[PDB]
């Protein structure tokens, strides 16, 4: 597998060069966020096709992973943009909202606590792209009966190992001791639990409040 | 604060001794089940397990350093995930089956007489397949279940006292990471393997969190089953 022969720095370079652009709101917030997320989705697809190992998977498996990950990925992008703005969520450069204005207030607070935790930890951009790759490959991997699917799962897990190794390398380069490398790895992956939880809450708050991209839509966008 | 002084070997031992008992389900169930009666057995088992889960939590190194309010907050956020990982562990040796209790072993086809539950089944069965394929060790299971207790609710805290406890929580989590790695090293794993397995284990926790969210919808919708703040409170003060 082409993904599996990459070094850490080559993996990090691939992800960095695949990063989607920071988009702008075009001006009711729900409409502004819906429009913004819809335009963000088109870039997420094309970024995902550039995650090493992702296009080795079958188209069906690619859609399943994107189905499961799409909101976690939008959310981690949001908390990364809002990192250097304590107390505010940087939805877009022209749409920077705070708690009162933001609210739906429960979701808002959890996002602010995620951003603050990333500020606390001095999360680096090279680490962020790795984390967002892990979300793409991990979130749907436990919910795919055949020998093809067994291979696909095995492939995903070996690419996930390659990203783990990449993360460890980045920390070792920054001088962290081995004890500090394992600890910080754990800290990063434990926040991914919180993101899933925020994604699930956002989903159910969407229901109580169509806008979720369908399996067929994702497959159309992936295949075109 | 004795908690952060422990070595890895004494962390394992502390958690192993803290493991709660395996309870039996209600012995006289009419079968086949209906939706109602199955829920009745499961709710009843979960309500009895919850009592023992409190006693275990108070023996997790560092848990009782927290204020009582924050102990409850952590149990509120984690209680279903902990019931689930325990269920997943019990069922490792039973492919295609969930061992709720030694006398309540259920297949996938039984889960569907509860309306929405078969999907959760499907997900809990796959976690037990995963754990079996990684040959998840008991000592690793007790570390993971402790991480859930302290992690699931930490991101929703906090002011100085709050920042102190969140830092105390993360320093215990760091100490359970150190422990997991120590286990992997003595089992002989290369460092590369030690890190890859740690990651593998911690990413499964995100799935467990999904399943809990899934399940919790159901309990609230489609609520009195969920243990209240007062109920947890007070089980905690019964010291
Ligand atoms: O105030 C809120 C906050 C959260 C929520 C609501 C109000 C009401 C219902 C939905 N929830 S939500 O949690 O599901 C969701 C996550 C985030 O906020 C919402 C939003 C969004 C809204 C419409 C969409 O079509 C797609 C996403 C968010 C978003 C958008 C672009 C990003 O790049 C990143 C995050
Ligand atoms: C085959 O019928 C099912 C199966 C799953 C579900 C339902 C029916 C109803 C809809 C919700 N789900 S569920 O996912 O939320 C939850 C996880 C597990 O099953 C449920 C359950 C439980 C049931 C009643 C409660 O009062 C408390 C918890 C579970 C449990 C109980 C004890 C354990 O020691 C470990 C896990």
From Swiss-Prot, chain A:
Nuclear hormone receptor. The steroid hormones and their receptors are involved in the regulation of eukaryotic gene expression and affect cellular proliferation and differentiation in target tissues. Ligand-dependent nuclear transactivation involves either direct homodimer binding to a palindromic estrogen response element (ERE) sequence or association with other DNA-binding transcription factors, such as AP-1/c-Jun, c-Fos, ATF-2, Sp1 and Sp3, to mediate ERE-independent signaling. Residues 7-224 are annotated as: Transactivation AF-2. Selective estrogen receptor modulators (SERMs), such as tamoxifen, raloxifene, toremifene, lasofoxifene, clomifene, femarelle and ormeloxifene, have tissue selective agonistic and antagonistic effects on the estrogen receptor (ER). They interfere with the ER association with coactivators or corepressors, mainly involving the AF-2 domain. It comes from Homo sapiens (Human). A lipid is attached at residue 130 (S-palmitoyl cysteine). The modification Phosphotyrosine is found at residue 215. It is found in: Nucleus; Golgi apparatus; Cell membrane. It is linked to Estrogen resistance: A disorder characterized by partial or complete resistance to estrogens, in the presence of elevated estrogen serum levels. Clinical features include absence of the pubertal growth spurt, delayed bone maturation, unfused epiphyses, reduced bone mineral density, osteoporosis, continued growth into adulthood and very tall adult stature. Glucose intolerance, hyperinsulinemia and lipid abnormalities may also be present. Residues 1-224 are annotated as: Self-association. Binds DNA as a homodimer. Can form a heterodimer with ESR2. Interacts with FOXC2, MAP1S, SLC30A9, UBE1C and NCOA3 coactivator. Interacts with PELP1, the interaction is enhanced by 17-beta-estradiol, the interaction increases ESR1 transcriptional activity. Interacts with EP300; the interaction is estrogen-dependent and enhanced by CITED1. Interacts with CITED1; the interaction is estrogen-dependent. Interacts with NCOA5 and NCOA6 coactivators. Interacts with NCOA7; the interaction is a ligand-inducible. Interacts with PHB2, and UBE1C. Interacts with AKAP13. Interacts with CUEDC2. 17beta-estradiol binds at residues 40, 81, 205. Phosphorylated by cyclin A/CDK2 and CK1. Phosphorylation probably enhances transcriptional activity. Self-association induces phosphorylation. Phosphorylated by LMTK3 in vitro. Residues 7-224 form the NR LBD domain. Changing residue 130 to A: Loss of hormone binding capacity and temperature-sensitive loss in DNA-binding. Composed of three domains: a modulating N-terminal domain, a DNA-binding domain and a C-terminal ligand-binding domain. The modulating domain, also known as A/B or AF-1 domain has a ligand-independent transactivation function. The C-terminus contains a ligand-dependent transactivation domain, also known as E/F or AF-2 domain which overlaps with the ligand binding domain. AF-1 and AF-2 activate transcription independently and synergistically and act in a promoter- and cell-specific manner. AF-1 seems to provide the major transactivation function in differentiated cells. This is Estrogen receptor. Residues 1-224 are annotated as: Interaction with AKAP13. Belongs to the nuclear hormone receptor family. NR3 subfamily. Widely expressed. Not expressed in the pituitary gland.
């Amino acid at each position: 597998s082409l993904a599996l022969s990459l070094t850490a720095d080559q993996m990090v370079s691939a992800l960095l060069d695949a990063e989607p652009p920071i988009l702008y709101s075009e001006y009711s917030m729900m409409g502004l966020l819906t429009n913004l997320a819809d335009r963000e989705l088109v870039h997420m697809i094309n970024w995902a096709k550039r995650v090493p190992g992702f296009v080795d998977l079958t188209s069906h498996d690619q859609v399943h992973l994107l189905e499961c990950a799409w909101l976690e990925i939008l959310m981690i992008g949001l908390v990364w943009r809002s990192m250097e703005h304590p107390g505010k969520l940087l939805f877009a450069p022209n749409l920077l909202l705070d708690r009162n204005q933001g609210k739906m207030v429960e979701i808002f607070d959890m996002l602010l606590a995620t951003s603050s935790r990333f500020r606390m930890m001095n999360l680096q951009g090279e680490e962020f792209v790795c984390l967002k790759s892990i979300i793409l490959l991990n979130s749907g991997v436990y919910t795919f009966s055949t020998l093809k699917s067994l291979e696909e799962k095995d492939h995903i897990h070996r690419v996930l190992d390659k990203i783990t190794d990449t993360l460890i390398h980045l920390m070792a380069k920054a001088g962290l001791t081995l004890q500090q490398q394992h600890q910080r790895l754990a800290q990063l992956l434990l926040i991914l639990s919180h993101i899933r939880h925020m994604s699930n809450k956002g989903m159910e708050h969407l229901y109580s409040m169509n806008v979720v991209p369908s399996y067929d839509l994702l497959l159309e966008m992936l295949d075109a």
